[PDB]
């Protein structure tokens, strides 16, 4: 399975002029592009080494699309103010996420699309991709506008064809690394809390993709998965254990890059 | 590529 996802953020800046707008693109768990109207070069630019070769042709189209979206989101922010009855003074946020997913067979599985206003769900494209549904009551006028203008058609065209088409193009361009599975390097650390209690921590380091399960065999702390910085991820699990017998507790690492699920022990 | 059209809410 593979997915092409974009995340768009517009943030009004009443003090300035145009709202801040940022678009990021992802193939699976790997960023490959970005647009940021505040950057030195306010254009769609490569964010992975395998995107350097694309010519003026591709980046121009993507900059037009990003700048056009920015310019519509600016209009939207103004209009959304009028739907809620908020002041001109406050800053607000419009977010937009769209993505398509392929199945094991590498063909279209599902497409999704939704809008958020101030981090709250606003408007969602239905699963059949043929109509929009309001998730906020304030979104009813936008829901009807979108359904009346047959907007879903353009998005269905995007999610079922254009998104699918390009995802395959990207997957070929990023051949070397996108299909590469990086297994985690795993270990266990000891940290005494007291004379009666101590901490055991199961580490998963330098893996790709981000998907991973770390279980312990109820005082279990589990951090949100984090980026290492070189496209690989890190994650740790921690369990609180009575000081003495720690060997009744074992860590279990399920991840795609491993031949078989791995058990960790802590070597004192 | 990103979606070439958005909604005018």
């Amino acid at each position: 399975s593979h997915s092409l996802k974009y995340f768009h953020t517009s943030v009004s800046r009443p003090g300035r002029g145009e709202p801040r707008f940022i678009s990021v693109g992802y193939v699976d768990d790997t960023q490959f592009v970005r647009f940021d109207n505040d950057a030195a070069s306010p254009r769609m630019v490569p964010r992975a080494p395998w995107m350097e070769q694309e010519g003026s042709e591709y980046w121009d189209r993507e900059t037009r699309s990003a700048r056009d979206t920015a310019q519509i989101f600016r209009v939207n922010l103004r209009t959304l103010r009028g739907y809620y009855n908020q002041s001109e003074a406050g800053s607000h946020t419009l977010q937009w996420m769209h993505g398509c997913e392929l199945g094991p067979d590498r063909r279209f599985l599902r497409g999704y699309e939704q809008f958020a206003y101030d981090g709250k769900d606003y408007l969602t494209l239905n699963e059949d991709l043929r109509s929009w549904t309001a998730v906020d009551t304030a979104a009813q006028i936008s829901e009807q506008k979108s359904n009346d203008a047959s907007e879903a058609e353009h998005q269905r065209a995007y999610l079922e064809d254009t998104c699918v088409e390009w995802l395959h193009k990207y997957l070929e361009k990023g051949k070397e690394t996108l299909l590469h599975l990086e297994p985690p390097k795993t270990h266990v650390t000891h940290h005494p809390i007291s004379d009666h209690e101590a901490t055991l921590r199961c580490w998963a380091l330098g893996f790709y993709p981000a998907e991973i399960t770390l279980t312990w065999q109820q005082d279990t702390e589990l951090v949100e998965t984090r980026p290492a910085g070189d496209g690989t991820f890190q994650k740790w699990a921690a369990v609180v254990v009575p000081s003495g017998e720690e060997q009744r507790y074992t860590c279990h690492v399920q991840h795609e890059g491993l031949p078989e699920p791995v058990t960790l022990r802590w070597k004192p | 590529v990103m979606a070439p059209r958005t909604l005018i809410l």
Partner: T-cell receptor
Amino acid sequence: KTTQPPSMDCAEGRAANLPCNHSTISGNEYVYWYRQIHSQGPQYIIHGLKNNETNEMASLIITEDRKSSTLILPHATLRDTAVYYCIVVRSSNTGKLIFGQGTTLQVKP
Amino acid sequence: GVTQFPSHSVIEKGQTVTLRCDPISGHDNLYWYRRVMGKEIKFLLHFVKESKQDESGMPNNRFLAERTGGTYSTLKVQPAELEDSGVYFCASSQDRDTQYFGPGTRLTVLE
């Protein structure tokens, strides 16, 4: 983009089939047809993506390969004498129309 | 339907004309198109509400267009040159897929 025959003669009462070619077309580009009678405002007729479509003005036939189109006017009259533009428009936030030469359709009485 | 004023205009090289368009009320998008005698109809500008969404067809600086309250639009040529003679069509849309045109302003700049 898009080629149409520059002119077309047609008998009134019978159906008119106006061809259009767009072999470079991609999967998110839409086939539109407008017309202009004399020098008055251009007039939306119909548009489609991949399958055929019909309204009260006209019908559209798009091949399975998507490389060509046909506007069908059901029962041509003298009012139907116009330039007919076949315009391909890629999904965009503006939907800007590029008017080619179009087909000058003379409905001969 | 879309409305346009004036229907005709003949003015001297150097003079000013304001062309006006009254779109089907409720339409978020308004477009200006023109046909420069001898050529095809060509895009000028697209307003989404009161904002300029696309300006790529706007000839030069002598042309200026506004849509203050996102209703009627105005297109001002100052100063007018001969090559600006032609027909200027206004259009409005709700879906951006179906564009409705007014009858146009016929403009002749004479020397």
